[PDB]
Amino acid sequence: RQIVVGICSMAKKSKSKPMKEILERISLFKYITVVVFEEEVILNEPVENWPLCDCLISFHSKGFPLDKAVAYAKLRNPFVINDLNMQYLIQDRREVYSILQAEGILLPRYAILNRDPNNPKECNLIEGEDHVEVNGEVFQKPFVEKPVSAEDHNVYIYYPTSAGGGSQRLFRKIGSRSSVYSPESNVRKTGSYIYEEFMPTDGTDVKVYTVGPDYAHAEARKSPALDGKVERDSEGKEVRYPVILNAREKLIAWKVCLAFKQTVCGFDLLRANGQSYVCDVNGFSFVKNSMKYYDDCAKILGNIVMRELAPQFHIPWSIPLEAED
Ligand SMILES: O=P(O)(O)O[C@H]1[C@@H](OP(=O)(O)O)[C@H](OP(=O)(O)O)[C@@H](OP(=O)(O)OP(=O)(O)O)[C@H](OP(=O)(O)O)[C@H]1OP(=O)(O)O
Ligand SMILES: Nc1ncnc2c1ncn2[C@@H]1O[C@H](COP(=O)(O)OP(=O)(O)NP(=O)(O)O)[C@@H](O)[C@H]1O
Ligand SMILES: [Mg+2]
Ligand SMILES: [Mg+2]
Ligand SMILES: [Mg+2]
Ligand SMILES: [Mg+2]
Ligand SMILES: [Mg+2]
């Protein structure tokens, strides 16, 4: 029989252009059949009624019942491409930075301010006009303030008096803007946050997209922190700049993919002071608008499935060579 690869995520993701392009290419594998779980089934049917698969590609996004995906995987024991329990930890920026540190990965200097929503002023924060002290640790402006929830994209940057003060407020893109300037110089007074050193870059972020530990595509984009105007092409897509990862960065990608157990994994690098710092790990993420990535991603994933499962199914398989980029 065919090896069945099940795709389990919200319809917004499962029906996205990149997903559709990659799935049509995985389907080209002679012994692989792809089954995409319907969103109504995922949300409304008990896991005992979900389709069977031998290999499961499943990932959390807004609205996804991760509890059910975990229960399905426990019930059916498929080969899991992106580990489901790690996807709880990826939702918490504190847990992400904790894992990165354990792996010897360079990250910005940071401190966590945990607030009790009933006792909001009893926390360990002291504010001056050009710095904050968080659990005794001093962060001079500029510094970055991130909600402890990785799904909350309201990241603020605070400017020093020498630069005119105020703050830059970042958010999920709304049309032509990714951030806005605020005259507010004081930090947020409710909620829990990570405070971290601002890393000076050339004004771009590097986005890295892994497909297993030995393949990573990278590209750069204008930092939303810069002025907040999105650069769009005549075709309406955000402008992306070419990047080739150096040896240190290729190792970072290997470590991130393995430490979070996410075969398909997006993360962000800040190229600053002659080194590269990880500032965000997002988990499952596909490159958009690269045909070569579609081809490579589908081949690599298909090959992983065949490597793992072909012996079980008595299918002959000789392990092929793959690009690292
Ligand atoms: O990783 P993914 O594939 O899940 O997508 C992420 C994010 O990628 P990231 O995690 O590496 O930052 C995308 O940013 P990009 O890389 O395309 O610039 C963003 O697209 P966007 O803001 O619409 O960008 P535009 O199309 O307006 O240019 C998208 O927002 P939504 O589609 O509106 O939900 C996000 O989904 P979610 O996190 O659920 O909000
Ligand atoms: N420590 C830092 N130093 C300099 N820039 C930073 C720093 N931390 C975050 N940034 C910038 O702020 C942007 C958003 O922060 P990030 O941690 O990526 O938030 P996010 O909400 O998880 N964004 P997303 O990539 O959509 O998941 C980054 O892309 C950088 O441009
Ligand atoms: Mg097929
Ligand atoms: Mg995500
Ligand atoms: Mg959007
Ligand atoms: Mg990011
Ligand atoms: Mg993120």
Side-chain angles (χ1 to χ4, degrees):
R1 67 178 190 181
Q2 294 285 96
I3 296 160
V4 177
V5 177
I7 310 304
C8 180
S9 63
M10 301 298 277
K12 186 175 173 176
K13 309 293 181 192
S14 288
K15 287 168 145 32
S16 72
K17 182 85 150 59
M19 176 69 75
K20 289 189 291 196
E21 296 276 0
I22 287 155
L23 299 184
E24 70 171 353
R25 287 162 171 82
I26 293 174
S27 289
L28 295 167
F29 278 75
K30 172 169 44 181
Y31 296 101
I32 295 176
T33 302
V34 171
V35 179
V36 177
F37 296 15
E38 295 286 341
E39 184 182 281
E40 183 283 323
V41 169
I42 292 165
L43 296 176
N44 296 333
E45 297 274 359
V47 298
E48 74 200 79
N49 287 350
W50 287 15
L52 296 179
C53 67
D54 302 292
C55 171
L56 177 66
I57 302 172
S58 184
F59 55 97
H60 177 269
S61 62
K62 185 183 175 61
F64 186 77
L66 192 49
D67 286 4
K68 291 180 80 174
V70 175
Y72 173 87
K74 189 184 185 287
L75 180 65
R76 303 296 184 196
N77 198 35
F79 167 56
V80 178
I81 292 285
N82 275 42
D83 181 86
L84 290 162
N85 283 310
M86 292 304 284
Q87 299 179 31
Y88 289 114
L89 298 182
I90 291 160
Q91 296 175 55
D92 189 337
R93 292 193 208 262
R94 300 168 294 194
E95 301 284 350
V96 168
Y97 276 32
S98 184
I99 290 152
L100 294 175
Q101 285 190 291
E103 294 296 322
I105 288 152
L106 295 172
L107 32 45
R109 183 172 61 88
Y110 76 97
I112 305 160
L113 184 70
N114 286 143
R115 267 200 188 94
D116 190 279
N118 300 128
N119 318 280
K121 298 162 191 176
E122 308 209 81
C123 60
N124 338 263
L125 171 79
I126 288 154
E127 188 169 30
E129 284 311 306
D130 259 345
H131 81 283
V132 294
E133 307 173 8
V134 182
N135 315 309
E137 190 154 359
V138 171
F139 296 82
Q140 292 289 324
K141 296 186 183 174
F143 63 76
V144 185
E145 175 194 57
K146 304 185 179 180
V148 291
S149 166
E151 312 302 316
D152 181 341
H153 303 298
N154 296 289
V155 170
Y156 291 12
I157 306 186
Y158 294 84
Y159 298 107
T161 299
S162 60
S167 52
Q168 199 73 19
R169 299 185 178 177
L170 284 55
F171 43 79
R172 260 288 166 272
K173 275 174 276 171
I174 306 167
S176 78
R177 297 205 66 91
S178 58
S179 74
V180 67
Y181 179 75
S182 169
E184 178 73 82
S185 290
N186 292 340
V187 300
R188 282 174 279 186
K189 283 312 169 319
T190 61
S192 301
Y193 302 95
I194 298 186
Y195 289 88
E196 63 188 62
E197 283 190 319
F198 179 86
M199 307 311 297
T201 63
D202 67 356
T204 64
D205 304 327
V206 176
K207 309 278 278 170
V208 186
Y209 299 86
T210 73
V211 190
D214 291 326
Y215 179 94
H217 173 74
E219 56 195 29
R221 61 144 204 215
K222 181 187 168 191
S223 171
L226 206 47
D227 55 81
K229 187 95 195 300
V230 182
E231 305 173 322
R232 296 210 180 252
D233 53 30
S234 32
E235 219 149 322
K237 304 297 170 70
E238 187 175 7
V239 173
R240 290 282 168 111
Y241 303 96
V243 173
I244 291 178
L245 296 184
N246 66 28
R248 280 167 285 165
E249 292 167 330
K250 289 178 186 290
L251 177 61
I252 293 166
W254 181 94
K255 291 187 189 175
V256 171
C257 172
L258 294 171
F260 291 90
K261 303 191 193 186
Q262 305 300 294
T263 298
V264 184
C265 197
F267 69 92
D268 299 345
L269 286 173
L270 305 171
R271 282 175 166 177
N273 303 322
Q275 299 295 336
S276 301
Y277 300 84
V278 175
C279 77
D280 188 23
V281 177
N282 297 135
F284 201 101
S285 184
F286 284 150
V287 179
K288 290 86 181 166
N289 310 121
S290 170
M291 295 291 167
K292 165 85 153 56
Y293 174 85
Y294 297 151
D295 290 337
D296 288 350
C297 181
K299 283 171 190 173
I300 293 163
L301 286 181
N303 287 349
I304 287 173
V305 169
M306 296 301 294
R307 181 178 76 203
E308 185 62 36
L309 298 172
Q312 262 176 246
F313 282 73
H314 298 140
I315 298 167
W317 193 253
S318 48
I319 39 100
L321 284 172
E322 287 158 3
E324 298 190 329
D325 197 8

Coordinates of all heavy atoms in Angstrom, one line a residue, residues 249-313:
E249 N 26.3 30.3 10.8 CA 24.9 30.4 10.7 C 24.2 29.1 10.2 O 23.1 28.8 10.7 CB 24.5 31.5 9.7 CG 24.9 32.9 10.3 CD 24.8 34.0 9.2 OE1 25.0 33.8 8.0 OE2 24.5 35.2 9.6
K250 N 24.9 28.4 9.4 CA 24.5 27.0 9.0 C 24.4 26.1 10.2 O 23.5 25.3 10.3 CB 25.4 26.4 7.9 CG 25.2 27.1 6.5 CD 26.2 26.5 5.5 CE 26.2 27.2 4.2 NZ 24.9 27.0 3.4
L251 N 25.4 26.3 11.1 CA 25.4 25.5 12.4 C 24.2 25.9 13.3 O 23.6 25.1 13.9 CB 26.7 25.7 13.1 CG 26.8 24.9 14.5 CD1 26.6 23.4 14.3 CD2 28.1 25.2 15.2
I252 N 24.0 27.2 13.3 CA 22.8 27.7 14.1 C 21.5 27.0 13.6 O 20.7 26.6 14.4 CB 22.7 29.3 14.0 CG1 23.9 29.9 14.8 CG2 21.4 29.7 14.7 CD1 24.0 31.4 14.5
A253 N 21.3 27.0 12.3 CA 20.1 26.4 11.7 C 20.0 24.9 12.1 O 18.9 24.4 12.4 CB 20.1 26.5 10.2
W254 N 21.1 24.2 12.0 CA 21.2 22.8 12.4 C 20.8 22.6 13.9 O 20.0 21.7 14.2 CB 22.7 22.3 12.2 CG 23.0 20.8 12.6 CD1 22.9 19.7 11.7 CD2 23.3 20.3 13.9 NE1 23.3 18.6 12.4 CE2 23.5 18.9 13.7 CE3 23.5 20.9 15.1 CZ2 23.9 18.1 14.8 CZ3 23.9 20.0 16.2 CH2 24.1 18.6 16.0
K255 N 21.3 23.4 14.8 CA 21.0 23.4 16.2 C 19.6 23.7 16.5 O 18.9 23.0 17.3 CB 21.9 24.4 17.0 CG 23.4 24.0 17.1 CD 24.0 25.1 18.1 CE 25.5 25.0 18.1 NZ 26.0 26.1 19.0
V256 N 19.0 24.7 15.8 CA 17.6 25.1 16.1 C 16.7 24.0 15.6 O 15.8 23.6 16.4 CB 17.3 26.5 15.4 CG1 15.8 26.8 15.4 CG2 18.1 27.6 16.0
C257 N 16.9 23.5 14.4 CA 16.0 22.5 13.9 C 16.0 21.3 14.9 O 14.9 20.8 15.2 CB 16.5 22.1 12.5 SG 15.7 20.6 11.8
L258 N 17.2 20.8 15.3 CA 17.2 19.7 16.2 C 16.8 20.0 17.7 O 16.1 19.1 18.3 CB 18.6 19.1 16.2 CG 19.0 18.5 14.9 CD1 20.5 18.1 14.9 CD2 18.2 17.2 14.6
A259 N 17.1 21.1 18.2 CA 16.7 21.4 19.6 C 15.2 21.6 19.8 O 14.7 21.2 20.8 CB 17.4 22.7 20.1
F260 N 14.5 22.2 18.8 CA 13.1 22.3 18.9 C 12.3 21.2 18.3 O 11.1 21.1 18.3 CB 12.7 23.7 18.3 CG 13.1 24.9 19.1 CD1 14.3 25.5 18.9 CD2 12.3 25.3 20.1 CE1 14.8 26.6 19.6 CE2 12.7 26.4 20.9 CZ 13.9 27.1 20.7
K261 N 13.1 20.2 17.7 CA 12.5 19.0 17.0 C 11.5 19.4 15.9 O 10.5 18.7 15.8 CB 11.9 18.1 18.0 CG 12.9 17.6 19.1 CD 12.3 16.5 19.9 CE 13.2 16.2 21.2 NZ 12.7 15.0 21.9
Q262 N 11.7 20.5 15.2 CA 10.9 21.0 14.2 C 11.6 20.9 12.8 O 12.5 21.7 12.5 CB 10.5 22.5 14.4 CG 9.8 22.8 15.7 CD 8.5 22.0 15.9 OE1 7.5 22.2 15.3 NE2 8.5 21.2 17.0
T263 N 11.3 19.8 12.1 CA 12.0 19.6 10.8 C 11.8 20.9 9.9 O 12.8 21.3 9.3 CB 11.3 18.4 10.1 OG1 11.6 17.2 10.8 CG2 11.9 18.2 8.7
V264 N 10.6 21.4 9.8 CA 10.3 22.6 9.0 C 10.2 23.7 10.1 O 9.3 23.7 10.9 CB 9.0 22.5 8.2 CG1 8.8 23.8 7.4 CG2 9.1 21.3 7.3
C265 N 11.2 24.6 10.1 CA 11.3 25.6 11.2 C 11.8 27.0 10.7 O 12.8 27.1 10.0 CB 12.3 25.1 12.3 SG 12.1 26.0 13.8
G266 N 11.1 28.0 11.0 CA 11.5 29.4 10.7 C 12.1 30.0 11.9 O 11.6 29.8 13.0
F267 N 13.2 30.8 11.7 CA 13.7 31.6 12.8 C 14.4 32.8 12.3 O 14.7 32.9 11.0 CB 14.7 30.8 13.8 CG 16.0 30.3 13.2 CD1 17.1 31.1 13.3 CD2 16.0 29.2 12.4 CE1 18.3 30.8 12.7 CE2 17.2 28.8 11.8 CZ 18.4 29.6 12.0
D268 N 14.6 33.8 13.1 CA 15.2 35.1 12.7 C 16.6 35.3 13.3 O 16.8 34.9 14.4 CB 14.2 36.3 13.2 CG 12.8 36.2 12.7 OD1 12.6 35.4 11.7 OD2 11.9 36.9 13.3
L269 N 17.5 35.9 12.4 CA 18.8 36.2 12.8 C 19.1 37.7 12.7 O 18.6 38.4 11.8 CB 19.9 35.5 12.0 CG 20.1 34.1 12.1 CD1 21.1 33.6 11.0 CD2 20.7 33.8 13.5
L270 N 19.8 38.3 13.7 CA 20.3 39.6 13.7 C 21.8 39.6 13.5 O 22.5 39.1 14.3 CB 20.0 40.3 15.0 CG 18.5 40.3 15.4 CD1 18.4 40.8 16.9 CD2 17.6 41.1 14.5
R271 N 22.2 40.1 12.3 CA 23.6 40.2 12.0 C 24.2 41.5 12.6 O 23.9 42.6 12.1 CB 23.8 40.1 10.5 CG 23.8 38.7 9.9 CD 23.9 38.7 8.4 NE 24.1 37.4 7.9 CZ 24.2 37.1 6.6 NH1 24.0 38.1 5.7 NH2 24.5 35.9 6.2
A272 N 24.9 41.4 13.7 CA 25.3 42.5 14.5 C 26.7 42.3 15.1 O 27.0 41.1 15.5 CB 24.3 42.8 15.6
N273 N 27.6 43.3 15.1 CA 28.9 43.2 15.8 C 29.7 42.0 15.3 O 30.4 41.4 16.2 CB 28.7 43.2 17.3 CG 27.9 44.4 17.8 OD1 28.1 45.5 17.3 ND2 27.1 44.2 18.8
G274 N 29.7 41.7 14.0 CA 30.4 40.6 13.5 C 30.0 39.2 13.8 O 30.7 38.2 13.6
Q275 N 28.8 39.1 14.5 CA 28.2 37.8 14.8 C 26.7 37.7 14.4 O 26.2 38.7 13.9 CB 28.3 37.5 16.3 CG 29.7 37.5 17.0 CD 30.5 36.3 16.5 OE1 30.0 35.3 16.0 NE2 31.9 36.5 16.6
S276 N 26.1 36.6 14.6 CA 24.7 36.4 14.3 C 23.9 35.9 15.5 O 24.2 34.9 16.1 CB 24.5 35.5 13.1 OG 25.2 35.9 12.0
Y277 N 22.9 36.7 15.9 CA 22.1 36.4 17.1 C 20.7 36.0 16.7 O 20.0 36.6 15.9 CB 22.0 37.7 17.9 CG 23.3 38.2 18.4 CD1 24.1 39.0 17.6 CD2 23.8 37.8 19.7 CE1 25.4 39.5 18.0 CE2 25.1 38.3 20.1 CZ 25.8 39.1 19.2 OH 27.1 39.5 19.7
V278 N 20.2 34.9 17.4 CA 18.8 34.5 17.1 C 17.9 35.4 18.0 O 18.1 35.5 19.2 CB 18.6 33.0 17.5 CG1 17.1 32.6 17.3 CG2 19.4 32.1 16.5
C279 N 16.9 36.0 17.4 CA 15.9 36.7 18.2 C 14.5 36.2 18.3 O 13.7 36.7 19.1 CB 15.9 38.2 17.8 SG 15.0 38.6 16.3
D280 N 14.2 35.1 17.5 CA 12.8 34.6 17.4 C 12.9 33.2 16.8 O 13.7 33.0 15.8 CB 12.0 35.6 16.5 CG 10.5 35.3 16.5 OD1 10.0 34.6 17.4 OD2 9.9 35.7 15.5
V281 N 12.2 32.3 17.3 CA 12.0 31.0 16.7 C 10.5 30.8 16.5 O 9.8 30.8 17.5 CB 12.6 29.8 17.5 CG1 12.3 28.4 16.9 CG2 14.1 30.0 17.8
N282 N 10.1 30.5 15.3 CA 8.6 30.5 15.0 C 8.0 29.1 14.7 O 6.8 28.9 14.7 CB 8.3 31.4 13.8 CG 8.6 32.8 14.1 OD1 9.1 33.6 13.3 ND2 8.2 33.3 15.3
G283 N 8.9 28.1 14.5 CA 8.4 26.8 14.1 C 8.0 26.7 12.7 O 8.5 27.5 11.9
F284 N 7.0 25.9 12.4 CA 6.6 25.6 11.0 C 6.3 26.9 10.2 O 5.5 27.7 10.5 CB 5.4 24.7 10.9 CG 5.2 24.0 9.6 CD1 5.6 22.6 9.5 CD2 4.7 24.6 8.5 CE1 5.5 22.0 8.3 CE2 4.6 23.9 7.3 CZ 5.0 22.6 7.2
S285 N 7.1 27.0 9.1 CA 7.0 28.1 8.2 C 7.6 27.8 6.9 O 8.7 27.2 6.8 CB 7.7 29.4 8.8 OG 7.5 30.5 8.0
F286 N 6.9 28.1 5.8 CA 7.4 27.9 4.4 C 7.9 29.2 3.8 O 7.3 30.3 4.1 CB 6.3 27.3 3.5 CG 6.0 25.9 3.7 CD1 4.7 25.4 3.5 CD2 7.0 25.0 4.1 CE1 4.4 24.1 3.6 CE2 6.7 23.6 4.2 CZ 5.4 23.2 4.0
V287 N 8.9 29.2 3.0 CA 9.3 30.3 2.1 C 8.2 30.6 1.1 O 7.6 29.7 0.6 CB 10.6 30.0 1.3 CG1 11.0 31.2 0.5 CG2 11.7 29.7 2.3
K288 N 7.9 31.9 0.9 CA 6.8 32.3 0.0 C 7.5 32.8 -1.3 O 8.5 33.5 -1.3 CB 6.0 33.4 0.5 CG 5.0 32.9 1.7 CD 5.7 33.0 3.0 CE 4.7 32.5 4.2 NZ 5.5 32.2 5.4
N289 N 6.9 32.4 -2.5 CA 7.4 32.9 -3.8 C 8.8 32.6 -4.2 O 9.5 33.4 -4.9 CB 7.1 34.4 -3.9 CG 5.7 34.8 -3.4 OD1 5.5 35.6 -2.5 ND2 4.7 34.2 -4.1
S290 N 9.2 31.4 -3.9 CA 10.5 30.8 -4.4 C 10.1 29.4 -4.9 O 9.8 28.5 -4.2 CB 11.6 30.7 -3.4 OG 12.6 29.9 -3.9
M291 N 10.2 29.3 -6.3 CA 9.9 28.0 -6.9 C 10.9 26.9 -6.6 O 10.6 25.8 -6.4 CB 9.8 28.1 -8.4 CG 8.6 29.0 -8.9 SD 7.0 28.2 -8.6 CE 5.9 29.6 -8.8
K292 N 12.2 27.4 -6.4 CA 13.3 26.5 -6.1 C 13.1 25.9 -4.7 O 13.4 24.7 -4.4 CB 14.6 27.2 -6.3 CG 15.8 26.6 -5.6 CD 16.5 25.5 -6.5 CE 18.0 25.4 -6.1 NZ 18.3 25.0 -4.7
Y293 N 12.7 26.8 -3.7 CA 12.4 26.3 -2.4 C 11.2 25.2 -2.5 O 11.3 24.2 -1.8 CB 12.0 27.4 -1.5 CG 11.5 26.9 -0.1 CD1 12.4 26.6 0.9 CD2 10.1 26.7 0.1 CE1 12.0 26.1 2.2 CE2 9.7 26.2 1.4 CZ 10.6 25.9 2.4 OH 10.2 25.5 3.6
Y294 N 10.2 25.5 -3.2 CA 9.1 24.5 -3.3 C 9.6 23.1 -3.7 O 9.3 22.1 -3.1 CB 8.0 25.0 -4.3 CG 7.3 26.2 -3.9 CD1 6.7 27.1 -4.8 CD2 7.1 26.5 -2.5 CE1 6.0 28.2 -4.4 CE2 6.4 27.7 -2.1 CZ 5.9 28.5 -3.1 OH 5.2 29.6 -2.7
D295 N 10.5 23.1 -4.8 CA 11.1 21.9 -5.3 C 12.0 21.2 -4.2 O 11.8 20.0 -4.0 CB 12.0 22.2 -6.5 CG 11.2 22.6 -7.7 OD1 10.0 22.2 -7.8 OD2 11.8 23.3 -8.6
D296 N 12.8 22.0 -3.6 CA 13.8 21.4 -2.6 C 13.1 20.9 -1.4 O 13.4 19.9 -0.9 CB 14.8 22.5 -2.2 CG 15.8 22.8 -3.3 OD1 15.9 22.2 -4.3 OD2 16.5 23.8 -3.1
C297 N 12.1 21.7 -0.9 CA 11.4 21.4 0.3 C 10.6 20.1 0.1 O 10.7 19.2 0.9 CB 10.4 22.5 0.8 SG 9.5 22.1 2.3
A298 N 9.9 20.0 -1.0 CA 9.1 18.8 -1.3 C 10.1 17.6 -1.4 O 9.8 16.5 -0.9 CB 8.3 19.0 -2.5
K299 N 11.2 17.7 -2.1 CA 12.1 16.6 -2.3 C 12.7 16.1 -1.0 O 12.7 14.9 -0.7 CB 13.3 17.0 -3.2 CG 12.9 17.0 -4.7 CD 14.0 17.6 -5.6 CE 13.5 17.8 -7.0 NZ 14.6 18.5 -7.8
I300 N 13.1 17.1 -0.1 CA 13.7 16.7 1.2 C 12.7 16.0 2.1 O 13.0 15.0 2.7 CB 14.3 18.0 1.9 CG1 15.5 18.4 1.1 CG2 14.7 17.6 3.3 CD1 16.0 19.9 1.4
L301 N 11.4 16.6 2.1 CA 10.4 16.0 3.0 C 10.0 14.6 2.5 O 9.9 13.6 3.3 CB 9.2 16.9 3.0 CG 9.3 18.1 3.9 CD1 8.0 18.9 3.9 CD2 9.7 17.8 5.3
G302 N 9.8 14.4 1.2 CA 9.6 13.1 0.6 C 10.7 12.1 0.9 O 10.4 11.0 1.2
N303 N 11.9 12.6 0.8 CA 13.1 11.7 1.1 C 13.1 11.3 2.6 O 13.5 10.1 2.8 CB 14.4 12.4 0.7 CG 14.6 12.4 -0.8 OD1 13.9 11.8 -1.6 ND2 15.6 13.2 -1.3
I304 N 12.8 12.2 3.5 CA 12.7 11.9 4.9 C 11.7 10.8 5.2 O 11.9 9.8 5.9 CB 12.4 13.2 5.7 CG1 13.6 14.1 5.8 CG2 11.9 12.8 7.2 CD1 13.4 15.5 6.5
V305 N 10.5 11.0 4.6 CA 9.4 10.0 4.7 C 9.9 8.6 4.1 O 9.7 7.6 4.8 CB 8.1 10.5 3.9 CG1 7.1 9.4 3.8 CG2 7.5 11.7 4.7
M306 N 10.4 8.6 3.0 CA 10.9 7.3 2.4 C 12.0 6.7 3.2 O 12.0 5.5 3.4 CB 11.4 7.5 0.9 CG 10.3 8.0 -0.1 SD 8.9 6.9 -0.2 CE 9.7 5.4 -0.9
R307 N 13.0 7.5 3.7 CA 14.1 7.0 4.5 C 13.5 6.3 5.7 O 13.9 5.2 6.1 CB 15.0 8.2 4.9 CG 16.2 7.8 5.8 CD 17.1 9.1 6.0 NE 16.5 10.0 7.0 CZ 16.7 11.3 7.2 NH1 17.5 11.9 6.3 NH2 16.1 11.9 8.1
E308 N 12.6 6.9 6.4 CA 12.0 6.4 7.6 C 11.1 5.2 7.4 O 11.2 4.2 8.2 CB 11.2 7.5 8.4 CG 10.7 7.1 9.7 CD 11.8 6.8 10.7 OE1 12.8 7.4 10.7 OE2 11.5 5.8 11.6
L309 N 10.3 5.2 6.4 CA 9.2 4.3 6.3 C 9.3 3.2 5.2 O 8.6 2.2 5.3 CB 7.8 5.0 6.2 CG 7.4 5.9 7.4 CD1 6.2 6.7 7.0 CD2 7.2 5.1 8.7
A310 N 10.1 3.4 4.2 CA 10.2 2.5 3.1 C 10.5 1.0 3.5 O 9.9 0.1 3.0 CB 11.2 3.0 2.0
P311 N 11.5 0.8 4.5 CA 11.7 -0.5 5.0 C 10.5 -1.3 5.5 O 10.3 -2.4 5.2 CB 12.8 -0.4 6.1 CG 13.5 0.9 5.7 CD 12.4 1.8 5.1
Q312 N 9.7 -0.5 6.3 CA 8.4 -1.1 6.9 C 7.5 -1.5 5.8 O 6.8 -2.5 6.0 CB 7.7 0.0 7.6 CG 7.9 0.0 9.1 CD 7.2 1.2 9.8 OE1 7.8 2.1 10.3 NE2 5.8 1.2 9.7
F313 N 7.4 -0.8 4.7 CA 6.5 -1.0 3.6 C 7.1 -1.9 2.5 O 6.4 -2.1 1.5 CB 6.1 0.3 3.0 CG 5.0 1.0 3.8 CD1 5.4 1.7 5.0 CD2 3.7 1.1 3.4 CE1 4.5 2.3 5.8 CE2 2.8 1.8 4.2 CZ 3.1 2.4 5.4

